[PDB]
From a paper:
In this work, we set out to find the physiological substrate of the cofactor-independent racemase (predicted DapF, FN1732) from F. nucleatum ATCC 25586, and were surprised to find that this enzyme functions as a histidine racemase (HisR). Here, we characterize this enzyme as a histidine racemase (HisR), and found that catalytic turnover is ∼10,000× faster with L-histidine than with L,L-lanthionine. The rate of HisR was not affected by buffer composition (PO4 or Tris), ions (SO42−, Mg2+, and EDTA), or the PLP inhibitor hydroxylamine; however, the enzyme activity was hindered by iodoacetamide and Hg2+, which are known inhibitors of enzymes with catalytic thiols. These results, along with a sequence alignment of HisR with other cofactor-independent racemase and epimerase enzymes, suggested that HisR operates via a two-base mechanism using cysteine residues 67 and 209. The DapF-like fold is an overall α+β structure, in which the monomer unit is composed of two structurally equivalent N-terminal and C-terminal domains.
To confirm this, we used site-directed mutagenesis to generate HisR mutants C67S and C209S. Catalytic turnover of these mutants was greatly reduced with D- and L-histidine compared to the WT enzyme, as expected. Mutation of an active site cysteine to serine is a common strategy to aid crystallization of cofactor-independent epimerases and racemases, and likely aids the process because this mutation slows catalysis and helps to keep the enzyme in the open conformation. In the asymmetric unit of C67S, there are two back-to-back dimers, while the asymmetric unit of C209S has one dimer and two monomers. Structures of C67S and C209S HisR were very similar, with a backbone r.m.s.d. of 0.493 Å by aligning α-carbons of 260 residues, and each adopt a DapF-like fold. In each structure, a sulfate (mutant C67S) or a phosphate (mutant C209S) is found in the active site directly between catalytic residues. The substrate binding pocket of HisR has an overall negatively charged surface, and does not contain any basic residues. The position of the loops above the active site spanning from residues 42 to 49 (N-terminal domain) and 197 to 206 (C-terminal domain) in HisR more closely match the conformation of the open C. glutamicum structure than the substrate-bound, closed form. Overlay of the structures of CntK and HisR showed that while these two enzymes have relatively low sequence identity (28%), their structures are overall very similar, especially within the active site. The positions of backbone atoms in DAP and 4-hydroxyproline substrates were highly conserved, and interactions with their respective epimerase enzymes were very similar.
Numbering used by the authors:
A (entry chain A): 3 to 265
B (entry chain C): 2 to 265
Amino acid sequence: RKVQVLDFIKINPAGNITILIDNFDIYDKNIPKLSEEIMKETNLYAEQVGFIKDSHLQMMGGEFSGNASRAFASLLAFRDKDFSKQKNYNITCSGESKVLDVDVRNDGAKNKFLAKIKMPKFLSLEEINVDEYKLGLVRFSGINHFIFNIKENKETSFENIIDLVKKYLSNEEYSAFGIMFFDSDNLSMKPYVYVKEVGSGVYENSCASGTTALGYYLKKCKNLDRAKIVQPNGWLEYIIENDEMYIDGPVEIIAEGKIYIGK
Amino acid sequence: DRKVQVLDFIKINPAGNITILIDNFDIYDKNIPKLSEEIMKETNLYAEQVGFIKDSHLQMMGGEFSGNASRAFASLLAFRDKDFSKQKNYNITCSGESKVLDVDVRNDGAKNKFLAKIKMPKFLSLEEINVDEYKLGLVRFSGINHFIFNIKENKETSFENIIDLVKKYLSNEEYSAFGIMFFDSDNLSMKPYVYVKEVGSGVYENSCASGTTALGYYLKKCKNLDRAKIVQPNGWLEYIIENDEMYIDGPVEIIAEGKIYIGK
């Protein structure tokens, strides 16, 4: 059979492992099929994958990803003869209609960077009481984040909550949701993400949109304007300024070259 | 204090035992262990083991033999041989193996897919142990001692129960490592459980060529089974006993290659 050779760049945006495929039809029909192949452990590993063209980033499912957009912005600095310490890069991403002005700065090594990006605004902020648990609820365009504060609630297993949430959205149509298990003693967060297609949960290494939900929620409930939220395999800082949300974090270009898959 | 190191990498999938081979590097660098450690992280290029190439030699990150890695190296040689058609034998060497390794590489469906057969080290001991209520066929080797367990031929048990029982065996025996081949005769399946004193914990590998070898030896005595294809958690390897010599066959796919950037 035919082996298809693609141009790849592997990047670690604060643990949210991203692969970017270059010189590829960003609107190819088979993108979702080869994307899951690119991500398996039996191939190059990845938590997400995108297909770049000029200054656009076409995610595998037309979704917007703050972490992926920051990886793409750090890649343009990596490849820019003129980049010194700081430089703003304008890009576009599927799922966001506005041009994104990403502030990229050097973070030590030439492959290491720090990328800040403007994050979408929330559509609603509710504080909900489900059964005998308090939860935070932040509704975005596409995904609904839930904030479960470990300390502020009684002892329980995560699994009980993932099920309880799933019960809350029983009579509510959604494409995906997220539970941000938040530990106040540490200012840490374990991001959870269910989606309809996968039909199963996924504990991520870091979740940019989830950190904004966390951020919006700590702003309204505790008057916290910006903070650094440590996550399973990385960290992200949320910044609220002039009523605008921004997520900053580290980024690192891992590897670059060719990837051989079937056709 | 900021410096990027640029290495040539090849990512291969020898029956689920993800391998990264580094090319054109000093295979006797002091920093090899630390470089292998960072390259293996999930937050980096992912890998279960790292090798370092020099001509026809493969230098594993610690100086130890790996049948899967060697199979991956040979498959790479075939990948880069413009004259490889459908089958070709390749002569290579591997750290921790005093004898040259003639590897039989064959096409497996495409230019990146290969079937590679390799000769494996012979066992140093073969014996049937009987702990508490269960029996288990120890097949020792220079490095690791594998503990076969036939589940169809044993009473109802828990995997963890056995693991503990075996770990208590090894108390009075100095062991740098040990493994447990959970073998199911009905489906010819095998769950390779491994343990290391340094790690202090176990892992169920996607494949173990040396464990399939141990299984094969015990099956040749306990059944007179000379060869069989053993399905594993994320891959399959076939064992072939021939002229009292152990071979391991299996698939190897070339995943990717290019450059990797590591700070120093």
